[PDB]
Amino acid sequence: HKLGERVSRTEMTDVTPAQLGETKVRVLNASGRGGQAADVAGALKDLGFTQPTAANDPVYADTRLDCQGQIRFGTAGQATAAAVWLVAPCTELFNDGRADDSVDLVLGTDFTTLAHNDDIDAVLSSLRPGATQPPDPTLIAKIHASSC
């Protein structure tokens, strides 16, 4: 239905991602694959995200979401959404106008695993305690300009 405003790759590439331990992520299953939200929430926790929650998506409850998925957030949560987008780079971004800083990672039918490579890993290291350098904007731009 109404998911809010589609946010462009161009706009989100300029957002500095949140520290992973300062995020509030919910993983929502819209894929039809049992246990997938719990699996991905655990994988996010292993990367350093504050323990995400895992549940079913109420929006696409009656039809599965036929793509990689979505990241849904409000303006207060945009840096968290930018952090999630590093590891789910082929999802669609929606600002749904919520007033808090929570972010929903919605798994579609096509989602398989979180993304990882040397560039993503380099950026994620800057979002953990003891980061040696601030998140590298060139790598962030490269990840999102070259994906999907």
Half-sphere exposure of 58 (CA within 13 A, CB side): 2
Q: How was this structure determined?
A: X-ray
CA–CA distance, 84 with 52 (Å, rounded to integer): 11
PDB resolution in Å: 1.6
Token pair for 119: 């560039």
> If you write DSSP's letter for every residue of 25-92 in order, what string do you get?
EEEEE-S--TTHHHHHHHHHHHHT----EEEE-STTSSS---SSEEEEE-GGGHHHHHHHHHHSTTSE
Cα–Cα–Cα angle for 102, 4, 47, rounded to 5 degrees:
35
Torsion angles phi and psi, residue 14, rounded to 5: -85, 0
User: What amino acid is encoded at 129 in this protein?
Assistant: P
